[PDB]
Amino acid sequence: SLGRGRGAAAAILSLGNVLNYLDRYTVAGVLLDIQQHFGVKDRGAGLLQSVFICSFMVAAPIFGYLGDRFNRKVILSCGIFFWSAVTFSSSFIPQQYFWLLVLSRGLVGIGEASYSTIAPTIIGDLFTKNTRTLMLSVFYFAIPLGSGLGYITGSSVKQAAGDWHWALRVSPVLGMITGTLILILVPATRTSWLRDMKALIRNRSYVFSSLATSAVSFATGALGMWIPLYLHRAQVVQKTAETCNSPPCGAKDSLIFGAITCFTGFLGVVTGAGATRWCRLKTQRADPLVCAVGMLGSAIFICLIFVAAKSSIVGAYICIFVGETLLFSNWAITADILMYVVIPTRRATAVALQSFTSHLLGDAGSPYLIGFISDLIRQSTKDSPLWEFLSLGYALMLCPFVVVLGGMFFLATALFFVSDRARAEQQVNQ
Ligand SMILES: CCCCCCCCCCc1ccc(-c2noc(CCCN)n2)cc1
């Protein structure tokens, strides 16, 4: 009935999503200064993101529940105000205390989980059909954009202000403004869990696809959480004796990584769509096959980046470009597979299930696992920047391995995709 209001609501929701991801990844951008100032080792650095993801995983379903039974717009505004306040207050934590930052991360994760679980429901309720899917697409466009802007803002504010605290002191004002706008312009708005559990435990292609998504989450969490620090360590190790005065400044690598991520999000989605469209003419199980090929390519390039980074950095940058492109090529394809195999009646429930699983074996403790392994290698050898480099590299060498199992699981679901799709088709429509 009204177009301007719906358009403004979509715009403010998309801006809120951008802000959400920016606040999510600013800490990953600025972790080096935090680690240096607080005097902690890689264990706590991983623990930050691990606690964030754990809080998000725990708090998503209850927030969704409160969303469908109670009012959504007020809950959305309360959540954005909550994580904005916690983010602003986190910058004032003194050096002598560390667990304060971790609990602040947990509260921020709670707020972001509320926002992420709530907003798609209203953004899809407002519109319908082609308009709805276009609006959902422009909504989800915020992820590769949001992560990149988070890296960019963290690095830029660190470089300009000269102290890392201000990295958390530029976003909350935008958060409060976005809360006021979402309150002003936006118009106001399970069953048989046991049976769905029992039915879905027997869907083998569903299980294999969920495991593949878990492996992808593991890889992307570890990479997007640890790569800038590894690059900085490599740069300083090269600078040990290449010039003896070359700037090892960290404000030149995080920006490049952020811009690269913004590019590869869209690039990988586009190339995955093109590849699946091309390959659907040959066979019927082309989607898991192209997912598996993308996983194999990503594993290959993630293998050679950790070797190329020893000598040349531009080689590492192009390798990571190709790696994240081929890694993100399967985003929409996984959801398409899930849409195709699962019966409509439990469909939504199934989706939620996958999220839970993808947040348990994926990025729940993956950054902490990498930190733990790097620390274990550290204590067994000497302490030196060169050994910092090799220890972090050896710890991070675990990602292509799990990517290889992800590709194998996509092959496994490829074998049974046709049979499961046929069974789903026969069951529906009677
Ligand atoms: C280092 C930067 C890492 C940045 C990635 C962080 C991922 C966290 C959230 C997980 C996630 C991702 C993508 C999608 C999705 N994309 O498209 C569609 C359907 C479109 C139909 N035409 N669904 C859903 C959920």
Author numbering: 96 to 284, 299 to 539
What does the report in the manuscript say about this coordinate set?
Due to the amphipathic property, S1P cannot diffuse freely but has to be transported across the cell membrane through active transport. Among these transporters, Spns2 is the first identified and the most extensively studied. Human Spns2 is a classical MFS member with twelve transmembrane (TM) helices and a molecular weight of ~58 kDa, which is small for cryo-EM analysis. Here, we reported two cryo-electron microscopy (EM) structures of human Spns2 in inward-open conformations bound to S1P or inhibitor 16d.
Previously, the Webster group reported an S1P analog 16d as an Spns2 competitive inhibitor. Here, we determined the WT Spns2 structure (named Spns2wt, without PGS fusion) bound with the inhibitor 16d (IC50 = 1.93 μM) using cryo-EM at an overall resolution of 3.5 Å. The structure of Spns2wt also adopted an inward-open conformation, which is almost identical to the Spns2fusion structure. Although the density for inhibitor 16d is discontinuous and challenging for model building, we roughly estimated that inhibitor 16d occupied the S1P binding pocket. Moreover, we could only measure its inhibition for S1P transport in the cell-based efflux assay when we overexpressed Spns2 without adding exogenous Sph in the medium. We speculated that the high concentration of exogenous S1P will cover up the Spns2 inhibition by 16d, consistent with the reported weak binding efficacy.
